[model samples]
Target chain A: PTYVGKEAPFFKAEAVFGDNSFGEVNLTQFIGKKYVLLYFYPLDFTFVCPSEIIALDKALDAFHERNVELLGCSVDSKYTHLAWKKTPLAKGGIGNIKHTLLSDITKSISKDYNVLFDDSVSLRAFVLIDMNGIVQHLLVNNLAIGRSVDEILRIIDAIQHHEKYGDVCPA
Target chain B: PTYVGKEAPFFKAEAVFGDNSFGEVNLTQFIGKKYVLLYFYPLDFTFVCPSEIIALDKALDAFHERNVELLGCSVDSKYTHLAWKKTPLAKGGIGNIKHTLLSDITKSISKDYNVLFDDSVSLRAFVLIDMNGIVQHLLVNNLAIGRSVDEILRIIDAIQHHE
Candidate 1:
């Protein structure tokens, strides 16, 4: 079965903080208190990658304003992640993205979510997990197309709005 | 017990060419014709990644001139690889990398080489294999640092010189 409408697979790994610090990042941390916007990209320093990464960073406050916690993930390590954070955008780096960038170095996280491509990389995938740890919405984009942060925010709004009003958002 | 000094693990996957086309990339294709320099990295668009990726690109001619095939691997797909290749460096893209970029989306290649990190990504790793498919040199770097293209070329020179 797919991961949607079910509990997200649990994982714990070293994550790179915005300040270039390292710490253990566990999925359980968000299970009870916040909605999680967990997304995965192919790599860090490629062309369209930084655009999405920076877009999410710029919209961190918007996500938080809606009680949603954002997490970015890739198959890169914490060390490479931290290096990217410290690098300025002028130099082809993402520049201190203000969110947790989970390191899926083992490739299991993507596999558990069934997003791992046959070529050993992840598609542009997103999962909207609620406070109860149930996945509410999922979106996967093709590698070349970047996702819209506005759509994610709108979906989150619709999810929460539906839960409260018992009325689903118009498709 | 490890891959070093052993036959390189066989793999087949879709790869992106310099012209933004997709095709099957098989390790066996180069086994008898040229030496293979297979390398793996954590992901595509992050920092420290492009430095090494582009450096290898800039040095592609040097590598091929010595009869070596340079292939870069990551968990990204062929579409993403091609998108990045077509992107220019001034805009934080890889800009026309002149080698084959293999998609390890399945991640078995990294696991086979023992380079997969605890976090589900491959470390900065390199494997130099001779025409016989035996790995002659293996180098893995900590994720914080980047590998040197010159060093890899030098090692290849030494390997061929020794042969």
Candidate 2:
């Protein structure tokens, strides 16, 4: 029922980076390196999780300073992610963040993460990976509510501390 | 793919008989007994097949005089068939009739006949079967058009004359 103390699910997917560029990344590429806060949200160009994405984007500096990389995954195409980024936040877009937004268009990545809904969209999810690539913290929640950035930072700090802490992810 | 000379696919299903009674019928029950004009229509209580059922009713005696029985099949329930038959012709009902209206509620009969549409309603179909239960003529048309009664009778007469 949980993935604590186990390897985070591997995902190699095309990604839209914060620099308005496209590339590919995977979970195993970050092993023995930076901790990862791989988050899964429902969709792009929608009103539900834009705030969470922006919150993660706002805390990009904070996470980078802490040697943690932020990765966002959704069932939308990488081009769809680009379209959302190019759109203004006033129009439900998560504009220009430095984090890696990996596309799970084939749904394999989200299915592997076990966060996919019946409609093919994902539940709001967060999987915190430690330096050794083991999943240390997990939160999954519904699409309506975004998780707390303060609590996420607190959990990230605690996980760094205990190998200390976590935020809410709703189904 | 034609079933003109082959045995008609058998079916045992709940049916509302001509005498305002509820019962069951199967294809094999009529074997060596009487010729069968088993007509499959779209639904009950609809405008499209009301006239078709009425036409079949209008020609019931013509078919019966020649040793044939009129049977109608649809995906509607027997109660639905009863309700429609009891309803007046001024409304969407078929009023009174002396023909067997078979209920194919499970849709197995229509599926077996290969006349079912995506919405589970059978197309306008007429399966002319002989006394030996061998399919003599099969005419399947869209729900949009009702076929010719004269032509059906002609085919029945032709099948009888040939046999």
Candidate 3:
């Protein structure tokens, strides 16, 4: 069965960080301490992806304030991700974005998340894996439309509330 | 085998028209039509849902401009949709939403559309079904977020232009 309610599938891939460094990011690393926002967008240097990546970057303090670790993934290579990061955001490159963006060039992580977009390239998609690695929320939007950072913050807060109060998350 | 790319399972549910009359909505009735923009949102009254639905409703003329019928499905009952519509645009109710807002209380439509949240209510989603009833485009957004009406318009426009 697709792993929706169970533990999130573990993944290990080379990722590029804000400091222009490349390192391995394991999905199991956050299982004990913090919530993980493992989001997937189509590609690094695209029309709509950067708006979302930048928005998340701008709101990093909020997610960090909630003790959530934000990680982004795409099918692009680590070099591609790094180069895109080095480029300026105003030029359509996600310059020095705040999160750890993974390069799932082999698509093992995409297959694990059940978000691969057929023969088509990866689209804008996301999975909010909680502290226990159980998926709390998920979204998959077409590439033409960008995502909402405000929605991400609100859902993370709602999930946190649910975890604390054990009630259905209220609007 | 998953149901992706397959013909959406059929259903007959109550649909509210512009005139506020409740009518039956059968997925099979539009079998031979060009295409349909079938979207599912959270509720008629909510923070972000109205903006999204009204955006689509505002573009209803543009939808018909391309011969694409807009069918909006919600888990709310027909009465709730009617009440929500009459409430007024300034008051957060999607008053007189221009498109057909189908009442999907049974939720079979949500299940068939793959738009239902695992443990909660319906999430924001849209599916494009073609003339042959084969699903062409599917997009899903979680609650608290809205979709871009322009992109939906462009995707439907691309499909219609190809046809």
Candidate 4:
């Protein structure tokens, strides 16, 4: 709620890619090039958390087809992020997810997005930023519930559809 | 290196379990119950990190049989720790590791242990703390190389043999 229809707060941090590489990720870098679908989860290696993380990874291509870059965030350090990616899915790991997982190791990124829970972890949350870096839509979910990838794509479709035709989808 | 023979520094943070739950982990909490094997990696999801992480996980029970509690840490956060655990090993993930992964997200934990790398991440390091909370052994590795589980276990064995 803090970022919708306004400028999404900017951040830069070390991130791990699905390919198991490490580098810096900056929210500002996505501006004017690709629409950003930034999401946050409570922690890694949890019951509900991995379901959502893998779900988004599975749907990464669909997001890219729409010129949207999906980035996942958590308060975990980058080292932990890399370790999880090396884990196997059949063994209860998320395993080589597509898209970049950002490490808000310091917890500042979660605080800026207003989604930090107990100052220890983040609640499930999503922020959609337009090509110009304006926050378009924001949704926060409870820890007990997992987010729907289908719903997120639908929202992105609605946003682009409205932009193209100047007519909003009938919700 | 600085921690050996000295009191290991204390810290508190949320850590992800090999079983995928999280809670505050404190160094002081383990002082009297068990010997502590604390290791640090440069980062997760990389070439050398998982080999070391999973190796320790595989031998977690052995360490426990000897009253040693194995804890892994890096400059990464708790969330990243969880994601790595969920990842499958066949695809380069450190899936389902058996020990708790500590999130030194603040990097202060790394600093206290003298393992922080350039203030950005941690060097590949390991510290063995006895049940009395005193450091007994310390090992630091270059980033390109992975750590040895067999050697670590032998070191633990030696420590106990001497004890």
Best by DockQ: 4
Q: Write the per-residue lDDT of candidate 2 for residues A46-156, one digit (tens) a residue.
A: 434477888878877889788999999986656557756765676555778778898775567777878888734688899998889899888889747767788999878
- Give me candidate 3's TM-score against the actual structure: 0.49
| Higher-TM-score candidate of 1 and 3 | 1
lDDT of 1 by residue, B14-83 (tens): 8988777789999889887889998888766564447888788888899889998998998765655765
Q: Per-residue CA lDDT of candidate 4, range B1-163, in tens? A: 4767888899887798767888888988888888998888776765553676767778888998999888888776675666666557775568887788888866788889887866567888889999999999988877558767888889989998987
* lDDT accuracy of residue A141 in candidate 4: 80
Q: How accurate is candidate 2 locally (lDDT)?
A: 0.78
Ranking by lDDT: 4, 1, 2, 3
Looking only at chain B, model 3 earns a TM-score of: 0.91
User: Residue B71 deviation, candidate 4, in Å?
Assistant: 4.8
Off by over 4 Å in 3: A168-171, B1-163
Candidate 4: segments with Cα more than 4 A from true spot = A1-4, A13-25, A49-66, A75-90, A93-100, A105-108, A118-120, A149-154, A157-171, B1-7, B12-37, B49-72, B75-108, B118-120, B126-163
Docking class of 4: acceptable
- What DockQ score does model 4 reach against the true complex? 0.31
Per-candidate local distance difference test = 0.80, 0.78, 0.75, 0.80
lDDT agreement of model 1 with the native: 0.80
lDDT by residue (tens digit), candidate 3, B51-74: 777788898898888878899887
